[model samples]
Target chain A: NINKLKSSIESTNEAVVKLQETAEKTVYVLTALQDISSQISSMNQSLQQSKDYIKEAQRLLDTV
Target chain B: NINKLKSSIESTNEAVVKLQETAEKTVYVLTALDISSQISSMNQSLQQSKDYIKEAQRLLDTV
Candidate 1:
């Protein structure tokens, strides 16, 4: 009766703890992804600048 | 002049795609956490009910 219910509750607690750990790890993963996303955006901006420089060099070559 | 720049862009696009996949996975993990939290609350309520049942049993035993 109540004994079985108590045992079930204990099992649920154990599962919930594991789920909580998984959630915590997911948070760390999300943080890492955010950092990587920011770095990619920065790299994209630099790439855009390099593209502009390439365009300017082409224009100078055409003038020469 | 643009060849190296194009290569860098392609690499960046690949990284962004991987990041998108991770974000999608994170969303699934969050949804699972929500389900687990709901189940935990249900379990807590069951425990409370069990406690009341024990109290009732004790009172009946006394009588």
Candidate 2:
């Protein structure tokens, strides 16, 4: 039984292992998606902060 | 305009505020993922019963 989402790593590991019964290939796909989600969450902050910086720069430029 | 993201609870809330845009996006991303897990569970039950939904239980005695 592939767990849709569980906050704990133990549950995640169990879900990943269960997915093996369905298809080993799908387990790989889900694993990759897991990493992608983490990356997005991590970079999300930096990327948005950069945009805000650009916005502030643009606003201050009007003084010139 | 408000913010697409936000996080933390600090001064000017600068650190948090500066991360406003990012925080907002993260909140939604995480929230949406949370919602999806619920629906997926519902679907799992329905999907399993798919093979159990028999219209006829008429047991046979065989030839």
Candidate 3:
């Protein structure tokens, strides 16, 4: 009866190793995405500034 | 002797269930990371758990 369990625990050890590798990979990719998103966020800020500048020019042109 | 073995099998079964639950949660939260392969890995663990259970039942029949 214990033999069954011994084998099972041994199998679990293997499972844990696989789980660790996959979990590590997930963390690595997620960190990379966080960096990529940071860049995109900065781009959005620059675009917003451009929009504001364009609006100010239009307001001045209308007065002319 | 067999009693000790039976207790061990019981403990192993509990471990497997806990492992399954943890793996499932990991899959759910990490889907954003495109963890399709990890999901497959979890499935394999679950399959192994089932095999162990079957083996325990076989031992029971013999005893």
Candidate 4:
């Protein structure tokens, strides 16, 4: 199931790329709306969590 | 500060749109790889949260 696993890994990588791009855009938008500082901080943390999860998912997929 | 609020709303709207688009793409990819149920559910929840937040921001701006 290496090929199957590889395909899954590729999909995860694709998602990671999309998320990272979106996260960057989100941070840029946050900077423009500094009044919502609390929400912005939480959103940034969430984005970082998502990034970490996806990275770990990719790593696990690779291990298998 | 209505003008500033409106501008902030506009930026939030833009980010929401981008997030919605990306969420759709991510869900599509997740469907092809059914093993990651946890991530898929979290992604869907995140999308809904963004939608709610955007709506609230819009309402607040109008107020």
Candidate 5:
């Protein structure tokens, strides 16, 4: 019997949809993480630079 | 609770193996049909030839 309403095909379609949804969610999370990581890394570098400058300034003042 | 946690005519792949098997079986039935059709055609030709030979033998009998 040629069936238009095949259960397997329907199930496969559903699985593909779920897979697509999960992949999309995963990509969204990764993209957000990349943006967050870039911001945090830049902040960390700025903080490190400020600390080094402050330490160098202290050394010069101690020379007085 | 039998979750693996889930999963196929669905080859369980983008390949879809169960569907492939069904398709393969359908093709096999079609192949068999082709062979049967050939046999039926052969039988029809053989019967026609036998009938012709019988007609010629009737003339030979008159000799």
Candidate 6:
């Protein structure tokens, strides 16, 4: 009887729901990774600026 | 009867395996996201701090 498969179907549906939610979250996570990738790149630029600033100060000292 | 249950068990096992893989990937993605944000924010702060240093040097030169 189909009754025998009832529990299996129910659990399968539950599994499907959870998997779907995870897939959505994974998409958002993917988008977040994309955004952060850009941010990290911009941060790399800032780091270079920091190095340049330190060198500028050192250069100023040498003038003395 | 038992064969039906066996098929069900196999399918369920397959689903569980796929779910496990996705969970692992989710964990990795979140971890990477966390680290990237942290590094970016810290870099911004470092930039902000250097601006202060430059300002301080300017003041010293004026004095």
Q: Each candidate's chain A: what TM-score? A: 0.51, 0.42, 0.47, 0.51, 0.46, 0.48
Q: Which has the greatest DockQ?
A: 3
Q: Which 10-residue window of candidate 5 chain B scores lowest in summed lDDT? A: B1-10
DockQ of each: 0.02, 0.02, 0.06, 0.02, 0.02, 0.04
TM-score of each: 0.30, 0.24, 0.34, 0.30, 0.26, 0.40
Write model 5 residue lDDT over A21-40, tens digit each, in one string. Answer: 33233223333432656555
Model 6 C-alpha lDDT per residue in residues B2-56, reported as the tens digit of each score: 4554454454445445445555555665676565554344334333433433343
Residues A1-64, candidate 4: write the lDDT tens digits. Answer: 4443434433443344445445444434433442456556755676676667557657666666
lDDT digits (tens) for residues B18-54 of candidate 2: 2233334334544554534433443343333221211
Weakest lDDT window of 10 consecutive positions for candidate 3 chain B: B54-63
Regions of candidate 3 where Cα sits further than 4 Å from its true position: A1-64, B1-33
The sequence of per-residue lDDT tens digits that candidate 1 reaches over residues A23-42 is 33344444444265655555
Best model per TM-score: 6
Chain B of candidate 2 achieves a TM-score of 0.31
Shift of residue B17 alpha carbon in model 5, Å: 15
By TM-score: ranked, best first: 6, 3, 4, 1, 5, 2
Candidate 5 regions off by >4 Å?
A35-64, B1-63
How many angstroms is residue A23 displaced in model 2 relative to the true structure, after the best TM-score fit?
33
- Cα lDDT for residue B61, candidate 5: 31
Q: What RMSD does each model have against the real structure?
A: 28.6, 23.4, 24.7, 19.7, 36.5, 29.1
* Residues B2-56, model 4: lDDT tens digits: 5544554454445455556656555554455442453444455455545544554
**Model 6 lDDT per residue over A1-64, tens place:** 3433433333343434344343443444455656655555554554455455445534543443
- State the lDDT at B48 in candidate 1: 44
Residue B26 deviation, candidate 2, in Å? Answer: 22
Candidate 3 residue B10 C-alpha distance from true site, Å: 4.7
Docking quality class, candidate 3: incorrect
The deviation in Å at residue B45 for candidate 6 is: 39
The digit string of per-residue lDDT tens for model 3 on B1-63 reads: 467556545745654574566467465756654455555555555556555555654544443
lDDT of each: 0.40, 0.30, 0.49, 0.49, 0.36, 0.44
Per-prediction fnat: 0.00, 0.00, 0.06, 0.00, 0.03, 0.06
Q: Count the backbone clashes (under 3 Å) in each candidate.
A: 0, 8, 1, 0, 2, 0
lDDT of 5: 0.36
